[PDB]
Design a protein around this ligand. Structure first.
Ligand code: HEM
Length: 292
């Protein structure tokens, strides 16, 4: 198991990272038109999870720390197609703040997007360090969507995530949508695409789902309301343990926010050793809380 010790960007503290937060949040506001006015919030949240989700607990490869990845077929793979827009969004931020590492920026982008879409506060730690010499390909490390509950449970054990963590994670605020041309799946999980909610769980339990074939010839669960669920999403109510938790989050927004917050931060911090002398996690204020 390689060891990856967090190292604070030289001389930086809270206020420096809140400035990066603010520029990300302000660009989020400014580039409102992206993806039929969904904006960049959702792809940023997906970007943070994708780079973090390359981690393997068994040898500590991958993860957010090194910020250095090689994306299968340079994003023209259904597993990662669409993420380049997220990296392109963060390039001007990186140019404005060249001192932040890549792992810190990718992960802070996901935290910023969640909060600015009114999701829970997500504490965030700095100190990931680029590892240009050691690149992690995402190839085969992220999960397939045409699978069942056992697949999902087993996949996530590699990320040291349990049933609750997994169900909290996948709902992912019901942000954004699947795009047929990226992934071979089409449609949103809910009606409020760029607001962080527990509506994934509600829709899953309350919508009338039909198992259909999309124009890419892949099966997905569809509702007359125009929502969709991937086979892996749907499995969360086919498995009896997952189903209980789905119901729990459907019925308690605050519990879901708190569980999501813990699991997302954990996900974003996997693979990383924080010195005992490391600063405490930062909780960034939103633009709205700052009156900006
Ligand atoms: C079993 C695990 C999961 C599967 C199979 C998977 C599958 C998918 C697929 C197929 C898409 C569509 C990509 C495209 O068409 O644009 C996608 C979207 C997305 N994923 Fe995942 N995902 C899973 C886990 C996660 C989790 C844990 C998060 C974050 C906590 C998440 C975040 C998102 C978000 C926010 C998008 C929307 C992107 C956009 O609107 O541009 N996913 N995912």
């Amino acid at each position: 198991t390689l060891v990856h010790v967090a190292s604070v960007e030289k001389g930086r503290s809270y206020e420096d990272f809140q400035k990066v937060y603010n520029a990300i949040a302000l660009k989020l506001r400014e580039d409102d038109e992206y993806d039929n006015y969904i904006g960049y919030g959702p792809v940023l949240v997906r970007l943070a999870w994708h780079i973090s989700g390359t981690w393997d607990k068994h040898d500590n490869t991958g993860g957010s720390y090194g910020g250095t990845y090689r994306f299968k077929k340079q994003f023209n793979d259904p597993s990662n197609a669409g993420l380049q827009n997220g990296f392109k969004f963060l390039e001007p931020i990186h140019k404005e703040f060249p001192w932040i590492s890549s792992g810190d920026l990718f992960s802070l982008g996901g935290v910023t997007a969640v909060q600015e879409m009114q999701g829970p506060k997500i504490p965030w730690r700095c100190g990931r360090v680029d590892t240009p010499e050691d690149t992690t390909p995402d190839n085969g490390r992220l999960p397939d969507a045409d699978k069942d509950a056992g697949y999902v449970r087993t996949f996530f054990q590699r990320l040291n995530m349990n049933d609750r963590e997994v169900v909290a994670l996948m709902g992912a605020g019901a942000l954004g949508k699947t795009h047929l041309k990226n992934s071979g799946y089409e449609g949103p999980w809910g009606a409020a695409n760029n607001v962080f909610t527990n509506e994934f769980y509600l829709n899953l339990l309350n919508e009338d789902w039909k198992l259909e074939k999309n124009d890419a010839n892949n099966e997905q669960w569809d509702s007359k309301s125009g929502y969709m669920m991937l086979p892996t999403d749907y499995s969360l109510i086919q498995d009896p343990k997952y189903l209980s938790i789905v119901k729990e989050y459907a019925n308690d927004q605050d519990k879901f926010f708190k569980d999501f917050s813990k699991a997302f931060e954990k996900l974003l911090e996997n693979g990383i050793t924080f010195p005992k002398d490391a600063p405490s996690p930062f909780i960034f204020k939103t633009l709205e809380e700052q009156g900006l």
